[PDB]
Amino acid sequence: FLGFLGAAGSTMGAASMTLTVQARAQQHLLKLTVWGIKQLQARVLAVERYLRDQQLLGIWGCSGKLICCTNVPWNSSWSNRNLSEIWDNMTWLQWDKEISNYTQIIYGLLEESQNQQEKNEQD
Amino acid sequence: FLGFLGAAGSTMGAASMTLTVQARAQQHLLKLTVWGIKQLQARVLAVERYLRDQQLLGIWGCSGKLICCTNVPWNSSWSNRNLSEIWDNMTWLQWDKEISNYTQIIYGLLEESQNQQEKNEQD
Amino acid sequence: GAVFLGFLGAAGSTMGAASMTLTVQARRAPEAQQHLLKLTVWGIKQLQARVLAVERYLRDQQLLGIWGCSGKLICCTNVPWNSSWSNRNLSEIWDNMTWLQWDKEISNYTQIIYGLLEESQNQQEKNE
Amino acid sequence: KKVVLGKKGDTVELTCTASQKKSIQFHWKNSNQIKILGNQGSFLTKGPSKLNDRADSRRSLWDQGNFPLIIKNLKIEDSDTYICEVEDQKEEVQLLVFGLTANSDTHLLQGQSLTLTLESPPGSSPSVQCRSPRGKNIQGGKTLSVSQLELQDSGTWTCTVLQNQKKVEFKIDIVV
Amino acid sequence: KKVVLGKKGDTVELTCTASQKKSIQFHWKNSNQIKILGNQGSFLTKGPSKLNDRADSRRSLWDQGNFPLIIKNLKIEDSDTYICEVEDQKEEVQLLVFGLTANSDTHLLQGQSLTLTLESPPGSSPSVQCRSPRGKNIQGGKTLSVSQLELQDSGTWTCTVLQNQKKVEFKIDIVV
Amino acid sequence: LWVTVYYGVPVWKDAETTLFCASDAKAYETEKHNVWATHACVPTDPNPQEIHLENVTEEFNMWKNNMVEQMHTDIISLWDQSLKPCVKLTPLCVTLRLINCNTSAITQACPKVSFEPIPIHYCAPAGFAILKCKDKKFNGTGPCPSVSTVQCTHGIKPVVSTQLLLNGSLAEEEVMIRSENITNNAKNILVQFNTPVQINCTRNVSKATWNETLGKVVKQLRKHFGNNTIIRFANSSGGDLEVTTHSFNCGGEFFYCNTSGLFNSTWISITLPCRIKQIINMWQRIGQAMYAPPIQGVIRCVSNITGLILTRDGGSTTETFRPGGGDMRDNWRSELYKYKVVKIEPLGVAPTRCKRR
Amino acid sequence: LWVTVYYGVPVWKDAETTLFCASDAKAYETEKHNVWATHACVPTDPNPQEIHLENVTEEFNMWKNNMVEQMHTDIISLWDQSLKPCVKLTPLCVTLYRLINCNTSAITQACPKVSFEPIPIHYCAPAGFAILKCKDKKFNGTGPCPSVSTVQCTHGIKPVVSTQLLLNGSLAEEEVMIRSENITNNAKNILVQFNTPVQINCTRNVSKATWNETLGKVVKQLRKHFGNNTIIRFANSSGGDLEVTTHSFNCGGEFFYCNTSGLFNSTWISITLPCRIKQIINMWQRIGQAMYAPPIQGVIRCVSNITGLILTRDGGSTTETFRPGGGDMRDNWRSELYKYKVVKIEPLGVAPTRC
Amino acid sequence: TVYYGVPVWKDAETTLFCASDNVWATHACVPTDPNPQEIHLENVTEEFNMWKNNMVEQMHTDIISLWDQSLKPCVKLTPLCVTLQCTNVMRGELKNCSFNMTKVYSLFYRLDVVQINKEYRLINCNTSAITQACPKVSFEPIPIHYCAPAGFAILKCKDKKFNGTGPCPSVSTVQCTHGIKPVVSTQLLLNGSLAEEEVMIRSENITNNAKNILVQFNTPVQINCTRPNNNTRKSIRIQWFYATGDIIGDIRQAHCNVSKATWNETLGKVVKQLRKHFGNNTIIRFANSSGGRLEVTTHSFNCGGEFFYCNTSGLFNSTWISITLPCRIKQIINMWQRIGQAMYAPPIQGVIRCVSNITGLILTRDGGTNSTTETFRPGGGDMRDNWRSELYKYKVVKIEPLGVAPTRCKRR
Ligand SMILES: *[C@@H]1O[C@H](CO)[C@@H](O[C@@H]2O[C@H](CO)[C@@H](O[C@@H]3O[C@H](CO)[C@@H](O)[C@H](O[C@H]4O[C@H](CO)[C@@H](O)[C@H](O)[C@@H]4O)[C@@H]3O)[C@H](O)[C@H]2NC(C)=O)[C@H](O)[C@H]1NC(C)=O
Ligand SMILES: *[C@@H]1O[C@H](CO)[C@@H](O[C@@H]2O[C@H](CO)[C@@H](O[C@@H]3O[C@H](CO)[C@@H](O)[C@H](O[C@H]4O[C@H](CO)[C@@H](O)[C@H](O)[C@@H]4O)[C@@H]3O)[C@H](O)[C@H]2NC(C)=O)[C@H](O)[C@H]1NC(C)=O
Ligand SMILES: *[C@@H]1O[C@H](CO)[C@@H](O[C@@H]2O[C@H](CO)[C@@H](O[C@@H]3O[C@H](CO[C@H]4O[C@H](CO)[C@@H](O)[C@H](O)[C@@H]4O)[C@@H](O)[C@H](O)[C@@H]3O)[C@H](O)[C@H]2NC(C)=O)[C@H](O)[C@H]1NC(C)=O
Ligand SMILES: *[C@@H]1O[C@H](CO)[C@@H](O)[C@H](O)[C@H]1NC(C)=O
Ligand SMILES: *[C@@H]1O[C@H](CO)[C@@H](O)[C@H](O)[C@H]1NC(C)=O
Ligand SMILES: *[C@@H]1O[C@H](CO)[C@@H](O)[C@H](O)[C@H]1NC(C)=O
């Protein structure tokens, strides 16, 4: 999980190109049992968090795809700039700031995207 | 991350929405290590069960998705009744009894329909 | 946790038997010698095996989603089927060739095979 | 309607088989639906009847799927139907028990009449032909009266109970 | 601005208020922004003032949200405003002290004038309303000339000196 | 009319699973029950996270349970390993319908050791959970209005007793009487008392406490019946001596207490004549056991009477219920009634509301 | 413009959750420090992974950092486990201004002589989180760091309790540094980090002319913040409880408090410090007092290096005087971990690829 | 197109861990798992070469690592090596030694101590610091299972004719290996695992003289050797150092008893199989130990922590056409043929009785005597083969279920 932010501070295009491929006596006894329990609890928490993120991405229809396009258009009524300016001038780190005021719309579109995909499959 | 349990006996349709965003000192050490391992087994077993479920949904042709629709008919012999009333005054727990004797059958037919669909798409 | 399996019969015969097998797959501590802590240790070993199994499955699934499969046991690609590498008859390599020795014959160049598969998925990407 | 006849004082065997071989709960009910005997776990409980000391069961065969009921020191009133319900079936068994004995203890001489007593059970159609091997193939009902007492008038042969093509054997006490 | 009044040597309990009840770092400052008393974790420190040997705080009350300041043996030159800095407040409290004494403890006759001494704090505006048990509410300056000595002149007085509607009971040494 | 497949829905299913025991074994006692608990039982849960479920209707069947049979086998293992029969006679008794058949005698280590029944909780393994319906008006079959999921059952004492359940659980509202099928006899009666009935056994039952409980049970029976044909307690039916007598073990000695006097009341302090026998028949399996003579030390045993077992009689007036027992499965049924193992299955099947091809 | 989802974009947001301790506890030591470490920590990873980041600027605030609160609570628990006071008073004073006697509860506990030896400790964020580390040596405590680097486990911190002098860890990398929330405000503490440690030996004594040189470096750094006038002065400690007035610390044996007048008596334009072991203390963990057993007869010698200073300037009315008075232990733990911040990974996004 | 979920194994290398049931011979290893799972594999022929196999290489690594870990814990005897004034006291060959500590008397054998310049000293104490053998620890062999960590499987070949190489008819997957007896033995194997009724000979290259020949008998043969020695033990300060004590009674060379009939019959089976390997017409002979470094010439073994060197050259020499046996003991040590420190094992008080079963034997074929006589002199000294013999059937594997195979598919 901390590997991803290695790409931060780079132009969003190069960041996404990189995103296309990321990972492609009692002394011993106590070491084995309690230390192992906690160390392994950490790994289980890691896999559970990753599975939660994967599930959330799955509800939107893009299961197991790092990059994908959903048929809902971008909400343009609120202020937004042109695509070429977006992908080049900025980088992903401050791109969270541009949508932080959209956080409610974020929570909208994050659910809205899945609502569109399920309405297309149901219709 | 698991979503094992959920809403109680209620209109199964409303519960249909609820799942979508529902979840996605030490005196003696020997008591902790033999009991913590059991709860850790429970968590990893739930994770493996979720992975198996997603795998089965995938071989049915819809992996990741939570509300999967594909072409497969509702056979009349499967305790046919008015759909509306099952939606209003029926819950998942009570409805599990009415479809238990047909569960393997519908699994098999959905499976061969998925096989036919992928064969037709390929050829 | 699908990494656990032992059936290896389809190797000599048609691979399709393995295809049926994978589809089927898809669907106390006496304390006399302090056996309590011993059972905890063995349970730790087994549960570690399970968590490493699921981690390995996800590691393979990330790579399989790099190509256009992402969890499908039976994937499909547009790369040429041999004709440049192990140009043996399809019948013998699907019905006579043992799975393990077949996989060695492939691992001669399996890395470039994966590379061409990734290129295939890349071409499928943004096809539009 | 399987039926057995005892000696009215002997030990008779009644068995109901369970093909499941599990040693499970069973009881015994009479024609009035009164418990007489059964198991509770791995024990033996006798139902509140008038035959508590008189009847019992063979515990050893319960594990192998045989659950019997054995009555000792039989008598006339013991003749009634019984039922097994080992899992759910009501396997019925008919019991008609009665004996035939003598009453003329010592007042017998050359030519005097001897008397026999037969316990006629209510609700039956028997025909007693209790005989002897020495030559007394006599036919009679309750009383066995013979004008002359020769050597061919004593002994005990196969007693013909004759209840629906079933035959048993018991003793007749007469000696010469 | 809360104002408290002293008796030239008594104890004064200035109070802050912890709106959080968490005992978080605070500091007691004076008008010249010189530290007097301060919290450091769970200890207690004193800054470089004229009250280092005099300042004190009831330590036990901090955990409940009370941060008192105690100045025993108060002197007039120490009359200055004090400020808490509990979390972000600049709660300003003022302390005023002036001592009523008599230069002639015993040199007095029947009808001889009497001289009182009020060591007032410089830069202050006291209102000396000496509420004397003779019925003479004397409105005067630093000294009060008593032109007559009667037998009723005994008893401790209460020269309630008001300053911006701030009153407090007073026990001055007038004994006969 | 095309079915789809929803996921994550709440669906439960009855299943049979092996269960693991969680007993609070001190492990530093010479008594064999505790060392067995260390031998095959895990310690108890540090903190039980019982999750209440509302608006849940769950068909509870206390007689079609699995914990009762699992703990039956486990407690047989307990009694064989701990209270070892130092003369044990068992009929191997091979078949060949009549067949003569043999008995084998086995000798063992034979120490006179006190039996202290510490509670033995039962916990379902990973992936399954036990369900308890907390309604105080459970009648043994049907829906339980309130149901809560838990991982470990309440602590049970593996008591062994006949005609009187000892050290058992207490009913909350009424002294409940439960039978699988009450309309006809040959089915046991299971009673749960609100208040424990103290007893004293030495080598007496307090009156005015047992009498009021009998009044409560006859009130409950007349509630179940038509207020007529008054139930009166009577003698033991007869048969094997263990079932006819109040048989129980504490301190390693088998005490058989005649209970006819207490079941001698007709409804519209008392001392018990207890005895000790060297020859027993094990509840675990068919056979007979011989044990060592009792220790000279006076054995004082005080145990609450919590449950009572009866049997009905067929009739052509007043009801007479005979003391029953010997079926230890029914005994631990009375304590583990409100429990049911279940497995969760998120996958489900859907209505026709879709058209996608 | 069509919204498309990306998984794994390098996006983080600042947020606190519970961190987990990591210590290479030997677990075969009877000292209660290793006992606590092995009870409630995990072994350090043999291969810590630190990926450097380029062209990234993050705003660090050590003063408002909240991981320090977690470490302070954890060490409070550690001290409750390790040093068991066999006379303990804790004010209750239930309130319905000295309304009641507020009588101190008088818990009495076991009084064993257990060695208390500090051991290195690491804090690692739970999975799904990152611990940023500012590598810039010019970091003045608050504001942006031009260069940052991510590592799951911070550098080994020795949890060491001490007033008036930090010691046993956290050496400065390049230059002596001065940090403060508000250097103008007198109340806020001033943390000073030493580039070179000065060895201090205390026995049942500090190296001179190395203390002098470090002090000169400190006054230079202070003048850098000030106007090069108002000559810095050190003097008698301010006054108050013994723990703050004099250098208080413990090393295996009983804690002791040492006069530091010789240490701070210079005005900038071998040193022996009288130290007294006391059994009567004011607990730093919570308000109250404690009494301990008399110290062991065996000679106890402690070797340490004074890597840090805590100074508070006098009130303004000229010249500036600094006195050592750091008692709030949160300050000591802010000094060691001034450059670490907990942050949460949020690897999702939205972009206009036009399908 | 890819076929996920397919069973494939690539022979790999992984660090297996202990499974044991103060003494360093039984150190804190993991307890042996309670229900070792075993799954048979039908129709699976797995290639093997336990000479070159990855399991044997990595097992050498694991064995060497564990022996290194297991040697250190005992305390050392670094400075005690000094000049010693000793006088000699079936020649006994025992020297009583005095060293000036303020003089102390101790007992050393002739072979452990050589002349220096009467004046006597240890062979290599100056060159290599000598290590004392801890009295608490005892040198005892126990069955040690080997377990593969998670993600690795252990393959076991259950074939009687296996010979350790080539295809194996029946194979199985096992979590933990069967108990391995770590036993020190040269030109011979003690208390090892019983072999198949037919006798196996294994060699990396049958023609090569350099490659050793290892033979496993079908039936164990009794090898019990006794040393009737009544020794004592002394507390001589260096810190209380603990050394050899005075002797009561008469010393005897440890005599070992072997049944001549069963030994002859086992080697008769052996020469039958050797005729199979080298030609029945060829006449096969046996000879005594070849020679070389004293340790490798003689059979070296340990009982009760005491090492006896059976240089019973008559036993290995069995001249053919195709009883009690004396032995010495040693107190100075070169174990695993290490050039480093030499630990020192002082004697244990009381008679030493060692009972064991002969389970194997190692020879080295003479260079070719071509088809006329095939002398097979006992060869050994490499401790690799002893553990190598016990686990010929085991290998490590990893699973890579990512098969790719060419099938027709168009899709989109
Ligand atoms: C039901 O619960 C009750 C508790 O409510 C429980 O009763 C307990 O039984 C045990 C077993 O006898 C009692 O333990 C006894 O304690 C005394 C005093 O400590 C011991 O001396 C006894 O052991 C000795 O007994 C002999 C003397 O007669 C000695 O000769 C012999 O060597 C033993 O050392 C014995 O252990 C315990 O006190 C009671 N608790 C009470 C009455 O509250 C009962 O067992 C449970 N089960 C049943 C079926 O009743
Ligand atoms: C900072 O780090 C230094 C690193 O050196 C550390 O110094 C240690 O302090 C202790 C206590 O002052 C020193 O004292 C003794 O060292 C010996 C040998 O290691 C130990 O055996 C001692 O432990 C026992 O001592 C008593 C002897 O009678 C026993 O009664 C008692 O119960 C103890 O078990 C004790 O540790 C130690 O030598 C140094 N150095 C090292 C390397 O430990 C210092 O404590 C740290 N903290 C501070 C605030 O300076
Ligand atoms: C469990 O609960 C059940 C409630 O549903 C109890 O029901 C019992 O069911 C049996 C049915 O076998 C009843 O027995 C009678 O069956 C006859 C059958 O008709 C003819 O058969 C007999 C000969 O076999 C003959 O004698 C009859 O006269 C008839 O000619 C019916 O006709 C009767 O009406 C009656 O149904 C039982 O009577 C009935 N129980 C009660 C109390 O009514 C069942 O008893 C319960 N079981 C237990 C173990 O508790
Ligand atoms: C228990 O109550 C249910 C509720 O409908 C009923 O069906 C059942 O017969 C009752 N059982 C008994 C034994 O009363
Ligand atoms: C400073 O003290 C520490 C003990 O905490 C020690 O490890 C280190 O070597 C000393 N010197 C330096 C330069 O850090
Ligand atoms: C050395 O020890 C042996 C055995 O105790 C003894 O026989 C011999 O006399 C000793 N040597 C000397 C010189 O005392």
Numbering used by the authors:
A (entry chain E), B (entry chain D): 519 to 542, 561 to 659
C (entry chain F): 516 to 542, 557 to 657
D (entry chain Y), E (entry chain Z): 1 to 176
F (entry chain A): 34 to 129, 192 to 298, 332 to 396, 413 to 460, 464 to 504
G (entry chain B): 34 to 129, 191 to 298, 332 to 396, 413 to 460, 464 to 501
H (entry chain C): 37 to 57, 67 to 134, 150 to 162, 171 to 185, 189 to 309, 315 to 321, 321A, 322 to 397, ...
Task: Give the text the authors published on this PDB structure.
The HIV-1 Env glycoprotein, a heavily glycosylated homotrimer containing gp120 and gp41 subunits, mediates entry into host cells to initiate infection. The viral entry process is initiated when gp120s bind to the host receptor, CD4, at the CD4-binding site (CD4bs) located distal to the Env apex on the sides of each of the three gp120s. This triggers conformational changes in gp120 that expose the gp120 V3 coreceptor binding site, which is occluded in the prefusion conformation beneath gp120 V1V2 loops. To investigate the role of receptor stoichiometry in CD4-induced conformational changes in HIV-1 Env, we designed soluble Env heterotrimers that can bind only one or only two CD4 receptors for comparisons with Env homotrimers binding either zero CD4s (closed, prefusion trimers) or three CD4s (fully saturated CD4-bound open trimers).
